[PDB]
Symmetry: C2
Subunit: 299 residues, 2 copies
C-alpha cells in the first residue's frame, strides 16, 4: 500500500532496540525512516529465516550508527566530545558488523565510511572551479550522500546470498535514489513546501553552499558566480542570486536530473530476477513507489 | 640478541609497505618500533606460512593506523581536516581488517578503538576526585594507552589459532607492558634522561595533566592538590609542586609500580606452552628482555 506502512512493524522493532539507551547516569524521524525503510524493503525484495531478518535489520542499525557518526564529525556538545561520540559510534558499528559473521559486508561499510570522508574532503578541498562544476558536484554528492545508502543496499544483498549481479542492482537502486533525494533536497531548500522560489529556508545559499540549481543557473548567467561568492558580505547578494535563479532554468533542470535518477532506480528494481512470491513483488513495488515519493515530496 | 635487531627485517618490510604513500599531487620512529616490535616478536613466539607472516604483519599495520588515527583526533592542519584524516585512517584500518578474513580479530580491534574512546572520555569527563585517584588513573591509563597493545597482542594470537588460554596470555603481556611503559613515561617527564627531578621536559605537569608520581605524592602531602590546581595561573606552582614531589616517594612509588607490571608481563611469557623451537624460545626471550628495557629507558 504505502512503502512505509508496509514495513512499519520491522521499523518499530528498531525503534525499540534503540532502547539500548538505558544506561544510568549517577548522580525529526523522517531521515531514519527513509534509510531504514529502503534497507528493509530491499531485504524482503530479494528471494532468499527470522535469524536473517535479524541480521538484515542489523545492517539497518549499523547504517544509522555510521550516519549519526557522520553528522557529529561534520559539526566540528563541544568539538572534542563530538568527535568522541562519533568514534564511539564508529567503534560499535564496527563491532556489530563483525558480529554479522561476514567479511564482505564488513568491507562494504568500511568503503562506505571511506567515501563519506572523500566527499567531506571534496567539499572542504575544492578549487573555486571545482565548486562551480556540475560534474564535481555530482561526484561529491555521490560520496557525501549516496555511498552510504548504496553500499548498504549491496550489503543487504550480499548478506542474503544474491548473485554478484543482483548485488550491483541493489547498489544501483540506492545510488540513484540517493542522488535523486539529494537533488530534490537542494531544490526544496529554495522553494520550500510552498513550491515557490524564495519561500524556502535558503540555508544552503545563505551559507555559501552552492548547489545544483545555482550551478545550472550559472551555465546561463556568468554574472552569478561573483554574486554568489559575496553571498556572505551582504545578504542582498542572496536576493540578487535568487533573481538570476528565477530567470534561469536551474530549479527545472535540477528536477529533471532528479527524475532521471529516480528512474534509473526504478529501472534497477525492474531488472531483478522474476519471482512468484507475492510478498517479494509487493516489496519491489514499494521500492518503486519510493522513487516517485522522493520526487514529489515538499518536506 | 637485541629484541629489536631480532626482527629488524620484518620491520623494514613495514617501513617499505609504508610507501603506499606514493599518490601524486597535481599541481621520531621509536614509537612505531615499540608497538610493531612487540607484535612481531609475539607472532614468532607462539608455535603455529609466509602467508601468515603477512597476515600477522597486517595486524601490525592496522595497529599503527588505528594509533595514528588516535593522535589526530586527540589534537582537536585544522581541526576538521584532522578529524577527516583520522576517519580516513580508521576506514582503511577497517578495510584491511576485513581483508584478514577473521571476524574475531575484527571484533578485537573494534573493542580496542572503543577503549581508546572510553579513556579519552575519562580524561575529559573526570571529577576532581577522579583526577586525583590512583585507581581511576590506572583504569584510564589502561584504556588510553594499553588497550591498543593488549587487544592487538590477542589478535596476533587468535589469528595464529592459539588456545583461548594462550590468547589471554598474549593480551596479558601487552596490557602489563603497556601500563609499565606509560608509568615509566610519566616518570621520565619529570626526570628526563638526566635521572634528575626537574631536568625533565615537564610537559604533563605544565599542562595540568596529573600523573602517577604526583598522585602518589598527594598521598603524603594533602597540600599538593590545591597547588597543582593552579599550575597554570603561575608557573611557580609547578616549581612548588616539584619540591613536594622531591620530598615524597612519588617517583619511587611509580617506578616500583611499573616494575611490578613489567614483571607480570614477563610472567605471562613464562606461562606459554613449552616448545622445542629454538626460534620461538628466542622470540619469547626477546619479549622478556623488552620488559626490562621499558623499565631502564631514559628516552
Amino acid at each position: 500500500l504505502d512503502p512505509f506502512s508496509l514495513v512499519a512493524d520491522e521499523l518499530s522493532l528498531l525503534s525499540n532496540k534503540l532502547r539500548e539507551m538505558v544506561l544510568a547516569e549517577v548522580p525529526g524521524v523522517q531521515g531514519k525512516q527513509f534509510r531504514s525503510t529502503i534497507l528493509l524493503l530491499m531485504a524482503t525484495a530479494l528471494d532468499v529465516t527470522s535469524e536473517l531478518r535479524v541480521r538484515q535489520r542489523g545492517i539497518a542499525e549499523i547504517t544509522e550508527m555510521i550516519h549519526v557518526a557522520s553528522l557529529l564529525h561534520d559539526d566540528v556538545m563541544g568539538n572534542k566530545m563530538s568527535v568522541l561520540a562519533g568514534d564511539f559510534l564508529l567503534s560499535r558499528a564496527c563491532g556489530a558488523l563483525a558480529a554479522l559473521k561476514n567479511t564482505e559486508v564488513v568491507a562494504l561499510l568500511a568503503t562506505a565510511v571511506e567515501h563519506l570522508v572523500t566527499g567531506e574532503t571534496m567539499e572542504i578541498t575544492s578549487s573555486t572551479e571545482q565548486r562551480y562544476s556540475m560534474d564535481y558536484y555530482m561526484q561529491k554528492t555521490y560520496y557525501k550522500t549516496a555511498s552510504l545508502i548504496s553500499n548498504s543496499c549491496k550489503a543487504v544483498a550480499v548478506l542474503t546470498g544474491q548473485t554478484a549481479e543482483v548485488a550491483v542492482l541493489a547498489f544501483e537502486y540506492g545510488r540513484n535514489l540517493g542522488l535523486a533525494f539529494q537533488l530534490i533536497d537542494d531544490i526544496l531548500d529554495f522553494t520550500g513546501t510552498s513550491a515557490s522560489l524564495g519561500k524556502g529556508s535558503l540555508s544552503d545559499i545563505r551559507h555559501g553552499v552552492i548547489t545544483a540549481p545555482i550551478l545550472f543557473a550559472m551555465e546561463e548567467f556568468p554574472q552569478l558566480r561573483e554574486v554568489v561568492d559575496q553571498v556572505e558580505k551582504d545578504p542582498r547578494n542572496v536576493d540578487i542570486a535568487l533573481e538570476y535563479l528565477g530567470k534561469s532554468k536551474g530549479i527545472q533542470r535540477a528536477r529533471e536530473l532528479a527524475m532521471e535518477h529516480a528512474n534509473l532506480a526504478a529501472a534497477a528494481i525492474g531488472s531483478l530476477p522474476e519471482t512468484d512470491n507475492e510478498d517479494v513483488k509487493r516489496s519491489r513495488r514499494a521500492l518503486i513507489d519510493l522513487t516517485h515519493r522522493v520526487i514529489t515530496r515538499n518536506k
